[PDB]
Structure formats: C-alpha cells, structure tokens
Amino acid sequence: TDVVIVSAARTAVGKFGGSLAKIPAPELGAVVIKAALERAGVKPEQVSEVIMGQVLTAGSGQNPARQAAIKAGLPAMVPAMTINKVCGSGLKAVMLAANAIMAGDAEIVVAGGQENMSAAPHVLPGSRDGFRMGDAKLVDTMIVDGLWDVYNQYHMGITAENVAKEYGITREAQDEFAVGSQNKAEAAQKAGKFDEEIVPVLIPQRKGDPVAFKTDEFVRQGATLDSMSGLKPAFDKAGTVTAANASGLNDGAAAVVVMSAAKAKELGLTPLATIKSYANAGVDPKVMGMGPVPASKRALSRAEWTPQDLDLMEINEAFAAQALAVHQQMGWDTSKVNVNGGAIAIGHPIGASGCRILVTLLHEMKRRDAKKGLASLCIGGGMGVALAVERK
Amino acid sequence: TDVVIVSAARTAVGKFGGSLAKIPAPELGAVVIKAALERAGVKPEQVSEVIMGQVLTAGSGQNPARQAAIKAGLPAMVPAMTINKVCGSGLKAVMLAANAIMAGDAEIVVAGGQENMSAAPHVLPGSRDGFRMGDAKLVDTMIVDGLWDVYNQYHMGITAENVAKEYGITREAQDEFAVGSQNKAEAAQKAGKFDEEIVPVLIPQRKGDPVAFKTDEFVRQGATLDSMSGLKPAFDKAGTVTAANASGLNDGAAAVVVMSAAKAKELGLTPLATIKSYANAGVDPKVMGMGPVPASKRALSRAEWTPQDLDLMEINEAFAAQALAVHQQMGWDTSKVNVNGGAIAIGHPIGASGCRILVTLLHEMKRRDAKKGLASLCIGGGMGVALAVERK
Amino acid sequence: TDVVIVSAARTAVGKFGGSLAKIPAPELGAVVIKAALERAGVKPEQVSEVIMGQVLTAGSGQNPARQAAIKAGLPAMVPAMTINKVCGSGLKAVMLAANAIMAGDAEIVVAGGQENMSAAPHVLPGSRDGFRMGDAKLVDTMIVDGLWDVYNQYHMGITAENVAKEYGITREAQDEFAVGSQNKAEAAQKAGKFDEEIVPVLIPQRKGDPVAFKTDEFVRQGATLDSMSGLKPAFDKAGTVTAANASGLNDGAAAVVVMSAAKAKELGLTPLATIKSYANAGVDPKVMGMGPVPASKRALSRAEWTPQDLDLMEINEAFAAQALAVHQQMGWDTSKVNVNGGAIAIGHPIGASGCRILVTLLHEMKRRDAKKGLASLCIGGGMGVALAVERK
Amino acid sequence: TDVVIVSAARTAVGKFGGSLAKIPAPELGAVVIKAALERAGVKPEQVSEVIMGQVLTAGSGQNPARQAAIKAGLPAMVPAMTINKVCGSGLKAVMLAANAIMAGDAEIVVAGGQENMSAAPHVLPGSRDGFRMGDAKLVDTMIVDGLWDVYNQYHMGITAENVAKEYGITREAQDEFAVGSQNKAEAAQKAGKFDEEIVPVLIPQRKGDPVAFKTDEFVRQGATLDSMSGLKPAFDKAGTVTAANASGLNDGAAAVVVMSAAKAKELGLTPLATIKSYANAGVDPKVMGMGPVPASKRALSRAEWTPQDLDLMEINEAFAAQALAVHQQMGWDTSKVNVNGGAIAIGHPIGASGCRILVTLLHEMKRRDAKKGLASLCIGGGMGVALAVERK
C-alpha cells in the first residue's frame, strides 16, 4: 500500500512569550487540523483518526490530541491519540499514520504536532507527601520534560557541546551556520515563500475583533556574523553554544492529511507527495544531536536512494553544532538543506517541529519542482526520525 | 503476515499511597519490559521499538517510554515512544505495535503501559508569567489529566452516572457486579492464578533486604453485598456510583512482546496467541463508558466472529455502571468475562490497564485452552479500544 | 521629659512594580536611617535603639529592623526591633521611641518604617502536611497580611465602602478629593517642596552607573475630575471606591531621630519639633477608616488643643471615602490638611506610611513656620494612631 | 511610679507537629490573654493595650496581636500591636508595656508572645514577577525568618558552635547540662510545679468534646547521659551541638498583665511582683548566644544589684553551648537558674519564650518566697534582653 500526503498546513511560529503565548496547544492544533482538512477537500466525518504530538502536557487536560480534534470540529466518532517522542513527535505522528494506513487499520489520518512552550507550568514534586523541613523545589516542566537529559542529568545544550567536541565543530562554524539560517528565512519571508503554508491564528483582543497572527515573528531581519560572535556561551563558560546558534523556545502547530493512494483516487484528490520511506534510530543520549544520521541512512536505505539522489531536505536545527555534525556525517549537498531557513531562525515548538519542517519541505518541493525529499530531526534521549517523500 | 504475542507480564497492582507509591512509573515499566523479554527468550538488542502508554507525565522527564526501556536493560540503539490515549493507552500501544509489524516498519516490539497515580504531582498554571495580585491555584495533575472530562468539566464518575441513567443500570446491580468482581479476584488469589503473570517489584525498606511486592493488594477478600449497599454515592448525592462499585486510583505496569509469526518461527518461539483483529471507536464524551461497544463490534467484524464465538473476555471495569451497560449491549455470556476478577477489585492504573487486562486474558486462555479471546476498555473523552486474540 | 525630633528623611515612594521593586525593604530602611542620622549629626555609635515598622515580612529573614540598622552602618551594639500595627506601624514606632525616652530606657532612637509591597511573596498554607487530593491555594501575602480584614473576611476597600455608606460620601465627592490630592502633590513637586525631605536611592541599571531615584513617581500629573470618572469600582461592583480614589500599593521608607530635649541641647542640635502628645484608639473593623477620629481627639485632648488650634495636618489618605468621613467628623480646616498632597497621589507603602507623613508634616511646618501639627492614620482591623508636634 | 505584674499565664509547650500543631498562634495568644486577665481580676474593657510577640507571620493575617486580643473577648476599643525581636519578642513586649506605663501613655497592658512553629508555611519568593525559565525555590519561613543568621548566612546552630569555641564549652559539658535540664523539668512536672501557671488549651476531637492539652510534652522523662553521648553533631561535623543539647521547634503562648502600682492599689489587687529594671544589648551576630551577658549586666546595674543578690533566675536555653557560656561569664550561682528546667526540655516557641520564662520565674519565686529574680534570653542577629523583678 502506497501512502500519500494530500494537504499540509502550519501556524506561524510564535516567539517565547509572544503572539501565541495565551493560546493553548490544542487550540493551535485545532487550527491546523481544520485547515489541513479544508485544503485536502476532506470532510471532518470522513477522518479515521487524529494523531498529534505534544511533549509538554502537565495540566493540559485529558488527551490533548482529542481536544484539538473536537475544537477543529471533528465529530466524537473520530478517535484521537497524543504521542510523545520529544522533538520527533510531530514527524513520528505521520509515520504512525502511515503504518496504520498500510496495515488497513485506518483510511484517512490527520497527523502532526502542537506545542505551547510559553504556557508550560511549574510542577511541585511530592506535593502529596508534604515538605516536613527546609526548602523545596518548584520544577520547570518545560525544562525537565522537554530539554533535560534523564540519564546524564544536564541540559540538551550540553549534548550539543559534546557533539561539537566529538566532531570538531568550532564556534565560528556554528555562528556562520546560524547567520545563514537567519538570512535564508529572511529572504524566504520577503519572497513570499511561507505565505501558502501558513494558516492564520485569530488572537482575541481586549476590545474589538480578534487579530490574525500569520508571520514567523522569531526570524531576525538583517542578522550578521558580528551580532553573534560577541555572545557568551549559554551552557558552559568554556563552551561554543549560545542563544544565537541554538533554536528558540517557541509555540506553534502543524498537520498533514494522510491516506492511501487508492483513497485519494476514489475521492478525486491530487496528492502533494507519496511517502517513500521512513525510519527511527537510537544513539547514545550524550550525543542525541546525531540521531538524524542513523535515521536518515535507514530511511534512505529503505527508499533505495543515496544522499546524492535527494533534491531537498529539512533537517531540524536544534543546535548549529549538531546540524553541522549531521551534514558532515551525511555528506549531502548542504545548499539543498533548509533552503528557506531552519529552526534557529523560525523557532522550535518541540512537539510540532517534526511536522512543521515536513509542511515547509512539501511546499518548497512543489515550488521548485523537486522530486525526492527528506525530513529528519534529533530527539532528546538519543534518537532520530526521518521520512522520505517523492513527487511524481 | 500475521502478528503474534510471544510473552506477557505485569506487576501486581498497588493501592493509592501503597506498596508502589514511591517507584516512578518508568521503573515499573522497566520491570515488565525486562520480564516480558526474558519470558519470551528475546535478547534486548533484537528489539525494534518500545511503545509504552503513560497518561500522567508531569515532571516525569523526557519520554517516559525511553526511560523505561533504558532501565530495563535495552541498549541505546532501541528507540521508544510514549503515548497517551487515557485508559486505552496500554492496549493502543499493542495495536500500534501490530500496525508497525504489518507495515514492515518493525520486527519485534515491546508494548504496554505504566502508571503511578500515587506520585502524580500538583502543578502551578501561569507560574511563568507570575501572579501580579491575588491568590493562585495548585492543580492536581492526577485529576485534571487523568479523571476530568475536558468538554463537560466533570469527573469520569458523572459519565458513569450518565451511562447508568441511559442504560437503566441500578445501584443494586452495580453492587452485585462489584461483589462478583471481588469474589472472583479472591478465588483467583487463593488458587494462585496470578502467580505466573505477576513479576515481583522489590521495594526498598528503611533497613533489611528489599521486600518483594507480588500480590494485588487492592483486592478485598470476603466482600459481600451488605458491605457495599449502605455506602453513599461518591460523585452525585442522588446517584448510584460509590467507591465500592468503581475502581480505584492505582499504580502498576504491564507489557507484551509482539512480532511477526515469521520472526517467531525463525527464533523458535511458540507464541501465546495470534493477534486476530483490533479496532478503536469514538462516542460522546458524556457516555465514554460505552466505548467498548462499537470498538468490540468493529474488532469482531474484522475478525469475522460473533460475540457468541468468544471463549473468554476481559472488559475493563472502570465503573460497574459502564461494565454492566456494555454487557447489556453486547449480549455476550458474562460468565466468560473477567473470570479472575476485574479492575473494581484489582485496581486501575490508568495508562497500564489496557495491557494489564491483556496479560490476564492470555494467561487464563492458556489455562482454559480457550481459542478466541477479546480485551476492551473505555476511554475518557469518549473512545474505546478492543483487541481480539486467537490460540490454535 | 520633653521628647524632640532632631531630623527626618524618607525615600521617594515607588510605584507598584516600579523603581524600588527590587530593593528589599531593609535596604530602603537603611537609606533613611543612615541619612536621618547624618542630618541630625549623630554618629551611629551614639544610637540607643532602632524601631522600624514593616508589615509584610514573609521570607524577609530575621528581624528586618536589625537588617536595616546593620546595612545603615550601625554597629552590632545597637539593638533593633520590628513592629507591626499595619498602616500605623511607622508612626507607632515614633510613639514607642518617645515612651522609651520618657521612661529612661533609651537616649537616642531612630524610628520609622519600611515596606516593599512589590516584592511580597505568595505563601503555601499547610505545606508540611501535603495536599492529599485536588486543588491547593497559593495565597498572596500582600493581600492577607496587609489588606484583608480578618474578622469580616473582605478587602480593606470594603471597609471604605462601609464608611462611604455610613457617612454619605458619594463617588463624586471621593473623586473631587482625589483630584485635590493629585493637584496639590503636582504643585508641590514643581515648587521643590519635597526636595529637602527625600533621600535618593541608587537603582542599578543593566548599562552604566546607578541612577538616583528621587521623585514620587505615582503622582498623576494634570489630574482632573474627568481622569477619575472613567475608573470602575475596584472592590465592590456596585460601590464607589476605585483605584483612582484610593491609595496605591507602593514601596518606600522613612525615619526620624528622637531624643530628649536635654540630650539635643547637650549635643548642640536644634530640634525640628517637640512631640506634644500621641494616642491610639480602636473602632469596629467594619469601619476601620474612622480610626483617626477617636485617635486624633485623644491626642488633642492630651495636648490640650482643639482641632482649630492646628496649623497643619497630615491625615493619611488610604481611601478618599474615609479621609472625607474623617474630615466631616473632626470639622477641622481642610485647607490645612495634606497641603502637599496625600497618599492617593504619593502612594502608601503600608509599614512606612506613618513615618512618611510625619516626615512630610515636619518639612512643611518648617517651610511655612507653622507651630502646631498633627499626623494621623487609620489601621486595618479597626484602629487609629495620632501624634501631635509643636515647633518653637 | 513603679510598674507591677499582677498575673501571669502560659500554655503548655507543644512539640513540633504535636498537640498545638493545628491551633494558629493568635488562638494560643487568646488563651493566655483571657486567662491572665481572669487571674488578675481585670475587666477586658479596662485594658489600654495588648502587645504580643510573634516571629513567624507569613499568611497569619493582619496584626496577629489584634487577632489574639479579639479572640480573647477584648472589645474593639482595645488597640493591639505585634512585635518581632526574634526570641526576645515576648520579654521585650513586657519591656514596652513598662515603658508605656511609666511614660503615662497606658494604664493597663497585656504583654507576652505567641508562636506556632509547626504551622509556619513555605513561601515562594518572586511569585509576583513569575519564573520566566528555570526552577523556583519554596523557602521554609520557619528557617529563614526564625533560625538563619542574615549576616553570615548560616543556622543559629553555627552561632552556638562559635560560642562553644570562643568560651571552651565542650560536648561533654553540653550534654551534662542538657541531661540536668531534662531531669529538673521532669522533677518539676512530677512535683506539680507547672500546674498553677499552665492554662489548658482545648484540642478539638474528630468525635466528642475537646480534650485539654495541659502538659509540657517535649520534656523527656528518664533522660540519661548515655542517651545523648552517642549522637552526631547536627550542624558541623567537627562540632559539639546536637539535637539533644539544643532546644526544639515548639508551639505555645504566654502573657502577663502589667499596670502601675497605683492602679493595682486602686483596683484592690495584690501584685505578683514589681518590675525592678530591664535592658537590651547588642553583640556580634556570630556569637548572638552571648546576648544575655551584656543585657543582664545592664539590667543589674540599673537595679543596683549584683549577680549574687539574685535569688532566682531564668536564662533561656536555646543551646547548652551558649547557656553554659553565659553562666561562666556572669559568675552567678547556677543552682538558682532554671530550677524547674529550661527550654532544652520544655521547648522554645520563639516569640513566646521570653514571656514563658518570665511566667515560670514568677510562679517559682512565690513558692520559694524569693525576693529578687531575673529573666534573660539571647536573640538571633546578636542581641540580649533581661528583666529584673522584686517581691516584697
């Protein structure tokens, strides 16, 4: 069974504390689910299943993905499920949709991710037992559930330093990479390249009608090497990783509609692309930033493609240090990677990024008529995911 | 190709604040992952993927499934994913495993769930922005994320009252049903029926050795109707649901090892059962308790079986009110259902239950040489999942 | 013994979350203690005791008055004590200083108060027992310790509505009074009338050297009746008290140096004034705002003065509703009251306000050579304090 | 004019988390304020003022002394003020009362202290501004506000180790002192020596009438040297201070009624004693335990008494280490000091201890017909207070 992607939509990515800060992750998920379905020409009642990635769910309520589906106007008859494979979540959702379609378990699946990093709360562990004596800890759920390695008990930013050391990725190289990402996202924005893929979110106002938010507000305009080389290291005073060469903390959602090629044909729909292959992989948690290498190799092996066969790629930029090490290990043409900027510039709403880069990939493939594409992400805890698509 | 279950294991279920209260959920998952693989005779490095359900993840750290996999002895190369379909999680994990094998995405998958309801913490919504003037609320994550309907803003116990009203399930029938569950679990404990299934959890002590926890401590021996019929309703003063005719808040884990029948043959393993079919379904959130009906009907339809074909069933008993309405609607022989007792007696660790009842089902099927089996549960937010198994 | 006041100093009053918000209260106290002594020409070593009012002390550390004394450069041999009589605290400090000198217990006392309302934290009641299930409350210490009536369980602003209703103080009359207060404080600032009394506080900046904070930043310039009539009622939706006709929440400190007439004469110091009399009183908590009526009458009876003998008064403006009711009951000449503006315009750092208005009264008495003055304040929980001063 | 003490009452001292744990400090204060008035034969209406010490007031509500007075049945016309001189507070309250009376500001004053250490909550500093990113600390108010030196940032415990070093107070001398305090308290308990002074507190019961709490429950009966001499140092691993040779964390309240001798004669009342003198003193915070030395010397000089004139003394036992250093420097007869034991055994409710030891002193003086007595305590932050009393 061939699986196709018939539509793709994303929100603009919000700055930390920015335009999307007050909009719960399921509400952002609902925007994209509703829009993806309208773009596909698929009625909500024809949907078999919704699968949404969301990593930060403390106090979010029962099954965020169901909440998104119901807010999108899908009937109660359509079941949904929430998944968490850290940054891989939103791409893993598409893989699960594909597995389900191939197995005959589902016909039409909406798959993506949703995240509001702004709104994540603090948690009080042991609050049931009480605190008999001395000071106690209110823990940042964004950090502990999203950005902290369990096995080594340090920040993701330290894994990035481990990678920069292991693979010889200098500060200067990372900064040059980050300026490239800002510069590409700025040119893409100015050329109108995100216009089609972005679906507006209506932001309620104190007085008057709500206002659409529809622009990637985290992108820096006129970014230069100098504005970066002055910064100090964020995670280790002898380190290379700064706020400027790492992605941000952000808010957003993305979704695609997936179905069998036969279902699309039955419905008269023209696919955007066919799912060619996908894979996951695991690596040591200390170097999680390298997960895309074994995952992309496996996805490419399953597709029967070489890295040279690829026309375009979206490799998520959690840290310039790992993105460079990935490109070094893969050996592919870096001029075809993240051609409209990456997460350093656009932002990184963790559970949504996997699907956000796929949505960006698909829209650029059509614009330049590229045929073979790949999306891949690293994953905290030492994993990678990758997914290959082909256009006729 | 078809998908087989080669082994199955569960912890005993703990009471709220009871023997497992200090063992974090991924540690409980590690116990059953490790035991399932040992029982199957499968080496850690041969596993393709781990899928664990866990609903309450506030401050649990990055990707609880991965945490469980690593704690179990699985090498870094084995990727893992956490899912949340509320009570359906544990069984949906097995279904996702099956889709993956049938799609050729994975060969050997460990699937199940884990939950520690005792250790679920409070969180502080809005802590990020601050509380400029006025009091602030700590919210209980166990209630909000585990037991509270989003759409209707009430407890799961009110959905159970809605179902009792709609289907005419009386207080006396609920109590009689609850007593039956207790008395069956009692008989099973006395007869050693859980001895094979259960994997001990070693509980550290102030001093001395660790103590092995290996009995379902929630079970009430000597239960009688007179012990139940005087209780006051728990959720609505004019209602029918009590703490004696509903399950509890509980801790535990369960897992199975799933692979293709071809892979099992290559490895010389004899499966416990073949996965015959499975299905999800959505219903109104108000009557979420009824999810097993259209899920089990769809699973049966896919198996080409009638309800009368079944030899044994496990249907989760979140509330006697819903379990009884399910049996009323399915028409099946209730002397074949939950023969060793159900959740009312054993307990209900929410993310684990789905796989726990599967473990119990498989082990009893072997003892009775039952050929056709079905497990199903209801899901907060208005869903069901059902999975059918067949033994030669 | 005659007790004389030899010097007097205060900070500018900061806005809520404003220029002082990050300067803890004992550091604000240390500024005014140090400066009062310098203005008096009294060395730190000669001080017998420091008495500082501070109301909100949650997590402030041991004995905030001692912390002020030490940060001001006083030697460890100078003992100190903190007190709390809500808004009366900073004036009550002076009264206790006077009692001590009269009794022979002390020779030189620095008295006043200090308060940082911006920095008051939230508290977690019952944090040692834990919260077995459901929501728990983080309580605002500023509201509960500073602004909430214990006996009636409602805000101080409700006591102000009670007073407005009992004495027939209209919204329009409160708004006219508020305009008066803003306009007098504005005139006084433009005329340099606070120049002598205010001591600078140095505020650290992200760039460059500290900048002196030295102006009453809460004062609304150009206020008219129209700027008041647009606010809505702040505490009772059907009431008359708004943010604009009530004092604000503020930060600041004030202190005076007190000693016997003989001691001043021996030291060659010319006093600012002699303490004539003082008094406290108690009223029903429901109408605490009327506290200054029985306190002022008692202080006047002990002075052998009538209200018409006064040349100048400072009657703290907690709420226009109560300040008007007090003027109505005393029948004194309102043109002689708060001639440089009141707390509605300048702000109300609760534990410092009593000494703040005293410092303001003294400097204005000196400027126009008024001979008889009175300071009085109402106190949460149903009290008043008053203190009379006489200049040669 | 001279000032007399006409009555004295205390609660029994509660152990941490024991009998008084649920009774808020002002309810404890109310018990002793009411009883001290009934003992004195003074009508509540005739009281000029209430002064209560209370150190831990986070979330206690507006002006805990006023709350005590109101719960004691005193009318709204009687004003009240709360003070904080750490452990000095309850005796300093009596000193302020004496100052008031001598200055003619008051006629009749109820003075003492109240503390519930058990119920002291955790605070969340910075809660108003929020926690943009990162973990936040819940601070224990009992430690920070009660037990931690501000200047040196360490426990009162370390100040005791400083004292032991400076004055050569060994671990063996500390433990002997502690066993002596325990044994004397036990003897006094058995002999009925606290029966008159103690007022019962009614503890509400889950069913039935309340149960009186009337005994000093922290006192260890059958205490022996072997029970202390194997304990590990509590604060410094090369130190001498243990949990057995320091006081505990305790709950209770104490109050006396103070008036002029003239007022007492007019009312026909026989005083317990005359206040002979009092004094405060400041020392370096590092050795705050030595406070009673300069304070008791100054009080004795003001009385024109020598240490050898004293018939009985109560010197608060915060730590054996400082109590022994005080005895060494004063030169007095230790057989006349804490004759019924001290705080090591009875306990140390910080804000109430100062008046607690005074109440104890006065009752024992009457039984022995002692003529000259002194009460003194050390104060965190480097202070001492002392008060001398004489009987005809």
List the helices and strands and how they pair.
4 copies of one chain form a homotetramer.
Chain A: E1 3-10, H1 25-40, E2 49-53, H2 64-71, E3 80-84, H3 89-102, E4 108-116, E5 122-124, E6 136-140, H4 141-147, H5 156-167, H6 171-191, E7 201-203, E8 211-213, H7 226-229, E9 251-260, H8 261-266, E10 273-282, H9 292-303, E11 312-315, H10 320-330, H11 343-346, H12 353-368, E12 372-379, E13 383-390
Parallel strand pairs in A: 2-3, 2-4, 11-12
Antiparallel strand pairs in A: 1-9, 1-10, 4-9, 5-6, 7-8, 10-13, 12-13
Short description:
The structure is a homotetramer of 392-residue chains. The first copy, chain A, is of the alpha+beta class.
Tell me what you see in this structure.
Four copies of one chain form a homotetramer. Helices cover 33% and strands 21% of the residues of chain A. Chain A has helices at 25-40, 64-71, 89-102, 141-147, 156-167, 171-191, 226-229, 261-266, 292-303, 320-330, 343-346, 353-368, and strands spanning 3-10, 49-53, 80-84, 108-116, 122-124, 136-140, 201-203, 211-213, 251-260, 273-282, 312-315, 372-379, 383-390. Chain A folds into two domains: 1-122 and 193-275, Thiolase/Chalcone synthase (Peroxisomal Thiolase, Chain A, domain 1); 151-192 and 276-389, Peroxisomal Thiolase, Chain A, domain 1 (3-Layer(aba) Sandwich), CATH 3.40.47.10. Chain A is globular, with a radius of gyration of 20 Å. In chain A, the strands form three sheets. In chain A, strands 3-2-4-9-1-10-13-12-11 form a nine-stranded mixed beta sheet, with helices on both faces. By secondary structure, chain A is of the alpha+beta class. The A-D interface holds A 17, 122, 124, 131, 133-140, 142-143, 249 and D 122, 124, 131-140, 143. Strand 7 (136-140) of chain B pairs antiparallel with strand 7 (136-140) of chain C. It is classed as transferase. Keywords: transferase, PHB biosynthesis, Acyltransferase Transferase. It forms a tetrameric assembly. The entry is titled "Crystal structure of Beta-ketothiolase (PhaA) from Ralstonia eutropha H16".
